[PDB]
């Protein structure tokens, strides 16, 4: 599989904090985000494996503000016996929705919007 990423090697490994922590689990993927963050522009970016540009498995997804700070993450449990597009889609619905309720403008990367929004 090729690793396909919307974020750099630095960004995908960068550690972060939440001023107001929130967790919800959808798709058996843990969505973690900072509820304090409001009105900002955010880009959702992922790091995942693909087999010839078709998603195999999400590895990690992070939401970055225009300030460059990570303000959210979607991470699978490292113990799922399979993976579906629907899992990632439902989890992206949690993260976009929480940010949107906090009035943020939410952008989605080129590949993420295919398998987690158009699917």
The runs of H, that is alpha helices, within the chain are: 9-13, 85-101, 112-113
Report the sign of the C-alpha dihedral through residues 97, 16, 22, 87, in that order: positive
Looking at the domain 1-119, which fold is it? Nucleotidyltransferase; domain 5 (3.30.420)
Decide: 115 and 10 in contact? Cβ < 8 Å: no
Domain residue limits, the chain: 1-119
Closest C-alpha among 64, 111, 53 to residue 74: 64
Technique used by the depositors: NMR
| Percentage helix, strand, coil for the chain under 3-state DSSP, each rounded to 5 | 25, 40, 35
CA distance 93 to 97: 6
Question: Helix, strand, or coil here: 28?
Answer: coil
């Amino acid at each position: 599989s090729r690793y396909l990423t919307d974020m750099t090697l630095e960004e995908m490994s960068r550690d972060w904090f939440m001023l107001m922590p929130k967790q919800k689990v959808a798709g058996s993927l843990c969505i973690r985000m900072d509820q304090a963050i409001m009105d900002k522009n955010i880009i959702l970016k992922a790091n995942f494996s693909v087999i010839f540009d078709r998603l195999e498995t999400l590895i990690l997804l992070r939401a970055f503000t225009e300030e460059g700070a990570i303000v959210g993450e979607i991470s699978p449990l490292p113990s799922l016996p399979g993976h579906t597009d629907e899992d990632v889609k439902n989890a992206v619905g949690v993260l976009i929705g929480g940010l949107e309720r906090n009035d943020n403008t939410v952008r989605v990367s080129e590949t993420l919007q295919r398998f987690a929004w158009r699917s």
